[PDB]
Amino acid sequence: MDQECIENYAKVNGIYIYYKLCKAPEEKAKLMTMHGGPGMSHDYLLSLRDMTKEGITVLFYDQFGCGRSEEPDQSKFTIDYGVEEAEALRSKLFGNEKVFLMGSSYGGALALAYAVKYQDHLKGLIVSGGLSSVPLTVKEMNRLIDELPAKYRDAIKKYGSSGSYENPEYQEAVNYFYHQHLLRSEDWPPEVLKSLEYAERRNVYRIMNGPNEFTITGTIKDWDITDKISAIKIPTLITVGEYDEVTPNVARVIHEKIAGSELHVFRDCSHLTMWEDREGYNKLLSDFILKHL
Numbered sequence: 120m121d122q123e124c125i126e127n128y129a130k131v132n133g134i135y136i137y138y139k140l141c142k143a144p145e146e147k148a149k150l151m152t153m154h155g156g157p158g159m160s161h162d163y164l165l166s167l168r169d170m171t172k173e174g175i176t177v178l179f180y181d182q183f184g185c186g187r188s189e190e191p192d193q194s195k196f197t198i199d200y201g202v203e204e205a206e207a208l209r210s211k212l213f214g215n216e217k218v219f220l221m222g223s224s225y226g227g228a229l230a231l232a233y234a235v236k237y238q239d240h241l242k243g244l245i246v247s248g249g250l251s252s253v254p255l256t257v258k259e260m261n262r263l264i265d266e267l268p269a270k271y272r273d274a275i276k277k278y279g280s281s282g283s284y285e286n287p288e289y290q291e292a293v294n295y296f297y298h299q300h301l302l303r304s305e306d307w308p309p310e311v312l313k314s315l316e317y318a319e320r321r322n323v324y325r326i327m328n329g330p331n332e333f334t335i336t337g338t339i340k341d342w343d344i345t346d347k348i349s350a351i352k353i354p355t356l357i358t359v360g361e362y363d364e365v366t367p368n369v370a371r372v373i374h375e376k377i378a379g380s381e382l383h384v385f386r387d388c389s390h391l392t393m394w395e396d397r398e399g400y401n402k403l404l405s406d407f408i409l410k411h412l
């Protein structure tokens with residue numbers, strides 16, 4: 120069964136980053152995880168921790184300016200910097216071993232940007248609810264907004280149009296959206312709540328993402344590397360939910376570009392598929408890693 124994890128606060132390429140590694144028994148493969156946001160934390164991905172009894176070691180770590188890690192210079196708020204951070208961590212920790220990469224949401228996109236440069240260091244890639252193009256995901260989310268009942272749809276196009284995010288009606292619509300496309304549940308896990316809490320307390324989510332999940336005005340609103348991800352040749356497991364805020368259509372684009380890549384859609388699921396179907400999610404990412412051992 121579980122055997123706790125080794126927590127540390129090491130110095131990466133310039134800044135102090137927090138990480139939590141859980142390895143063995145009978146380790147077969149090592150796996151690094153990248154939370155979403157931007158500006159969240161490993162916390163909400165702690166369900167993937169169950170894969171250790173399946174011989175999978177997991178590396179949970181808060182990215183720059185996230186969770187328990189120090190915030191770098193405002194200019195370092197880019198995805199290209201996260202990639203340099205990831206590689207530095209994998210190396211000054213695992214040496215020159217080939218590790219499996221797992222990215223969730225923004226982490227998925229980051230995970231992709233990683234493979235585009237350091238795929239040779241990876242043995243496999245897992246992109247869950249991720250994206251390769253922000254403008255695309257934005258276009259997809261807008262549809263979801265229009266598909267929401269007028270009671271909330273209008274509130275999102277009104278108060279979200281006058282900068283009135285502190286409005287209760289609007290905040291009411293944001294919630295309905297989250298309980299529909301972010302996480303389908305009434306008893307949200309603490310891990311998620313902590314990562315969400317970390318998003319409102321730091322500055323990354325603010326400066327890179329925006330007010331909320333469906334109102335991106337940060338510094339990635341134009342990010343798009345679709346014409347780059349085609350160069351990835353390693354085994355890729357792309358998962359996405361049915362009601363996923365980052366539609367399976369956006370997951371489809373990634374599927375095309377990556378040859379031989381798998382694509383799995385979780386019915387009755389949304390964005391955080393980690394808690395909606397923990398056993399099935401982990402099982403899928405587990406067998407994926409074990410076959411491409």
Ligand SMILES: *[C@](O)(CCl)[C@@H](N)Cc1ccccc1
Nearest residue numbers: 155156157224225226256335
């Ligand atoms: C994920 O990182 C949430 Cl865990 C998500 N915010 C990424 C994203 C979605 C839509 C637009 C930009 C980023």
